[PDB]
Ligand binder design. Structure first.
Ligand SMILES: N[C@H](Cc1c[nH]c2ccccc12)C(=O)O
Length: 308
């Protein structure tokens, strides 16, 4: 029997810890107890910042990284931080995994990728009402990676930071809101601090579950087939779980914390998407500079959406 330590950064109630426990449960069952997983939520073994270098060094066998936290490190997979028009985490998670499977880009070659998934589409959660793009001008809003670049294009003032830091940051006025999926309203009780939600339907945050290469290779071939066997299935399961939970989280925020929901005029939606168009070209150029083929990646994303 082997035991793998699985490091995670956010609290146990958030969906990246929920999916980790479900994955562990499937591993235990399909390997008939030949593999066990000891999980460490809340940064008790590795936090957001040292997660990648701590999995690669062996301080943890398995870890969960939010790709948007590591700008310039993932030139190919960061395409998934651009607005690709996904409305569900299930479809996004599934396409992300299939894209990774077919490309196996070199940026992730020093680790073994066990599975991937994404958040749901991002929205604005603010302390003060955002009813139009004008209200957003100058406003300090939390994002990370390309979601920050989207905020800047909209005229907001992006402040980049990992999730576990955001509550204190809101609570003390350093930021006026955040740009992400609405599950955090409940799971991290942002419904108490940010009383306003504005629909944006924007890019998702992509994640990878990563494993130390040596640890992966000391596993028997049949255990390895079980874990690879779980990859696509779990990507879909996570997105599915998250799409339902967003609905629950939001019903709970509205009818037990008075959260007000807003929607942008049709001309603001139009203008906002024109503003962000140039992020696709800046993404392609950064990718091309690091040796990847942005044309094939975009071709592949297109084909996989036409199919999920
Ligand atoms: N805000 C993004 C993605 C995200 C959405 N929900 C959670 C919950 C816990 C951690 C991250 C996220 C991010 O910071 O990665």
């Amino acid at each position: 029997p082997v035991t793998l330590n699985y490091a995670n950064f956010p609290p146990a109630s958030t969906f990246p810890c929920i999916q980790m426990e479900q994955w562990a449960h499937e591993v235990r069952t399909r390997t008939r107890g030949k593999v066990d997983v000891l999980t460490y939520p809340g940064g008790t073994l590795l936090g957001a910042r040292n997660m990648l270098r701590g999995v690669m060094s062996g301080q943890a066998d398995i870890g969960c990284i939010s790709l948007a936290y590591h700008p310039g490190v993932f030139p190919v997979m960061s395409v998934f931080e651009l607005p690709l028009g996904f409305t569900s985490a299930e479809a996004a998670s599934s396409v992300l995994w299939e894209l990774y499977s077919g490309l196996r880009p070199a940026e992730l070659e020093r680790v073994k990728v066990l599975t991937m998934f994404t958040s749901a589409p991002s929205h604005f959660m603010t302390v003060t009402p955002v009813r139009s793009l004008r209200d957003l001008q100058g406003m300090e809003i939390r994002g990370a990676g390309t979601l920050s670049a989207i905020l800047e294009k909209l005229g907001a003032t992006p402040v980049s930071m990992p999730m576990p830091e955001v509550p204190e940051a809101v609570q003390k006025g350093i930021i006026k809101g955040l740009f992400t999926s609405l599950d955090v309203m409940k799971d991290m009780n942002f419904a108490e601090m940010t009383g306003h939600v504005t629909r944006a339907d924007q890019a998702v945050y992509p994640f990878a579950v990563i494993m130390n290469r040596e640890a992966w290779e000391r596993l028997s071939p049949d255990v390895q087939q079980v874990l690879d066997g779980l990859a696509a299935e779990h990507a879909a399961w996570t997105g599915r779980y998250l799409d339902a939970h967003v609905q629950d989280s939001m019903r709970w925020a509205e009818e037990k914390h008075g959260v007000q929901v807003h929607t942008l005029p049709e001309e603001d939606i139009a203008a906002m998407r024109r503003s962000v168009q140039p992020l696709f070209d800046a993404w392609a150029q950064r990718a091309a500079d690091k040796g990847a083929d942005p044309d094939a990646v975009m071709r592949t994303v297109d084909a996989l959406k036409a199919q999920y």
